Amino acid sequence: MPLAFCGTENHSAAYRVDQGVLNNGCFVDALNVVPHVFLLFITFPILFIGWGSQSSKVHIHHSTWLHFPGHNLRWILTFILLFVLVCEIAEGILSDGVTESRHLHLYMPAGMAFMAAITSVVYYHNIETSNFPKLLIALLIYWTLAFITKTIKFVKFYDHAIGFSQLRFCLTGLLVILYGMLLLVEVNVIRVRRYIFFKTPREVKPPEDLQDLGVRFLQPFVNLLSKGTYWWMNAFIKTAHKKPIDLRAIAKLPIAMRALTNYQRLCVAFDAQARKDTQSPQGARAIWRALCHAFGRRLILSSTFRILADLLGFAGPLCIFGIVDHLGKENHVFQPKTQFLGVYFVSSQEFLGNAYVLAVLLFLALLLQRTFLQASYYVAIETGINLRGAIQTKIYNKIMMSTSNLSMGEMTAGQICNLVAIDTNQLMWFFFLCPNLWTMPVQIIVGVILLYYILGVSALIGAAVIILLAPVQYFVATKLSQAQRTTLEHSNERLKQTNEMLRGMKLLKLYAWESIFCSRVEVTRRKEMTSLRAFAVYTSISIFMNTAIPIAAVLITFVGHVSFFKESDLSPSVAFASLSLFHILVTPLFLLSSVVRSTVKALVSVQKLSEFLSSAEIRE
Amino acid sequence: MLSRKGIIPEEYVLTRLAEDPTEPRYRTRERRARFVSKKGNCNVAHKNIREQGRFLQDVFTTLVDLKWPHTLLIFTMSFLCSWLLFAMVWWLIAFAHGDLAPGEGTNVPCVTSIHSFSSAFLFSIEVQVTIGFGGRMVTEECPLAILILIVQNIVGLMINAIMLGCIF
């Protein structure tokens, strides 16, 4: 009873090739093993040579990166085929359970394919760090070879009347499409860089921004997966432990984020709009359209990541519901009904109903969310920071203005400096919280929808309690900001008085007038202390609300469902899926008030900036 | 979340002014950059080198340059990858030829005494290292086995020749 590739039932009758060499359902799996192990045994010597070269003599310490055409879509196809290969492994482990011994022909090909995909992106990266695309022939034959072999497997399944009921048919069909859509990528590289069958290769030089000697913020010129997890930051962070961070140790920022480059882009938007449209002034709405047209191509991308991250965030409570539902019912059967040619096919419903499989899927879903959410954050921040540079340059351009008593007597240099600092910072902070207004409504809507499905009308009562904490937080935060305004505009006078009564220390000390002026300052300090007491009250209500809205909602939720409703008796699956949903919904509900305030202040800031940017100029 | 969203407002009335820099001494930080170390080891870090594959095209200069432990790894992996690759081929041709299923007395297997993948892997060891323990022959039943035998012998001799040259 040893480890056999096709099992050991019916006296090894699974190995008979009498009817057909390629009609033996275990032989097609054996064929699919070949292209993956072929890549491993042709690339491992190459990879170890590369690793040795890095160790013994890493001559190109700052080697430039040349990314081949079709490089972002290359990585995303690898990511989604890694997903399906994990699912194939899960199906194989789940189907072999109903046999006398482990079959090994359900999850050996998928396991070696999983390792082959990982090694085929490591090999591709090592052939992208140093521009040498002739070694990519090994990858083109590999992809097409795999596409051939499982195509044979796919057509055999359709002959034997498998259909879309069996999960592995769907997985194999989808995976075959993946291999075709990535073989096309490889031939795209052939077509562009013209290295294999064309007369003269069309070489490309690395972008000039990376060619600059001092550029440490090399975020754009990085492979997609190190953009997700910020792997390039590791070396920089390690260096910061030994040597400090000097202003000459920080990078010279790339061309894409230069102030003048963003200023030129913003000027292009302004000029194109003001020419194609007969709107004579460049007023508030003109600037609003200009910002959208100039930075929309990145703002939309951030929103897409945020929406995907939100939809994947709701896969934690839902998977918990599935896991704990399966975890009861005494596990009476746990058997695969479908039988085909002595092998069992786990149905789709039988797949997402298991516990270990759902837990592995939950882990993978979290890996996507935690990275999409951070990727969405970075795109929003980078667009906001580029906005700050362009807007600051634009403001300073109009400063180059007439010094009339009408203009200079209305907005003094203090006003314009405050305009620069305050308005642009809170306009930038609007572009940070900008994907929220597109996503957070979807988050709340979809959260309430699927929370109703899990529990019922009592969940809507609890959702009402939480959704009744955005207006409460809004009023408290407005009161908090008003109290802070009063306290801060009072300490300004105190600080000016203290500076005035401490600059002349010698004069006051000589006349024995040090303590008297100290008490004159302490009086204003006591007044500011009363104001700060109001500020402390209004900030303690916010701490209370933040840390007691979810708990009060939970109490109302469950008490209503048991006492008032009595519809369905509580279960651990329902009662913890709903509780987990409450945490994931409390996080954005509180911050929604700050998003609204930021949007309001953004409108007022652009009103300020448009009353300035269209003032009286100097001359022609 | 101390300042996750509440850091947007700016006072713009801060009292911050000039302060002592307390910069570290430049003499201690600055050290004479030696062109070459006391014993060779030229300390001239290169930068911005454009890579056109020149460093990986001359694989034999690279192989000799590498340290012995890395050469041992490449030595071992080259042999073991070829051994495993041809083991897969030998196992799969046997399982395709249907000779490890029947056990029938009249059928003549194309590779005698193939019973599993361990036997196929041992047969791959014997062919490429040229040991030939005799218990796993090649019969005349399928000409594909003869072609694979030719390919395996030629590949093994090429690999041995290249590794011999690098070692010398």
Binding site: K242, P244 | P24
Partner: peptide, 4 residues
Amino acid sequence: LSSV
């Protein structure tokens, strides 16, 4: 150094 002293900074470290």
